[PDB]
């Protein structure tokens, strides 16, 4: 899953967006992901 892995990686707010494209679901749960665990 390329949006899986992108949060996992503690990727930045951009790269949510586009790992998760287009999605905005997943999108939204990269970025709390990322807000909150990195």
Same mark, same amino acid.
Request: overall charge negative; hydrophobic content about 30%.
């Given at each position: %899953?390329?949006? #899986?892995i $992108?949060? =996992? =990686? !503690? +990727? @930045? *707010? *951009?790269?949510? %967006?586009? #790992?998760? #494209?287009? %999605?905005? *679901? $997943? +999108? /939204?749960?990269?970025? /709390?992901?990322?807000? @909150?665990? !990195?």
């Open positions: %899953d390329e949006c #899986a $992108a949060a =996992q =990686q !503690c +990727t @930045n *707010e *951009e790269g949510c %967006d586009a #790992a998760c #494209a287009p %999605d905005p *679901e $997943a +999108t /939204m749960g990269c970025l /709390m992901y990322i807000w @909150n665990n !990195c």
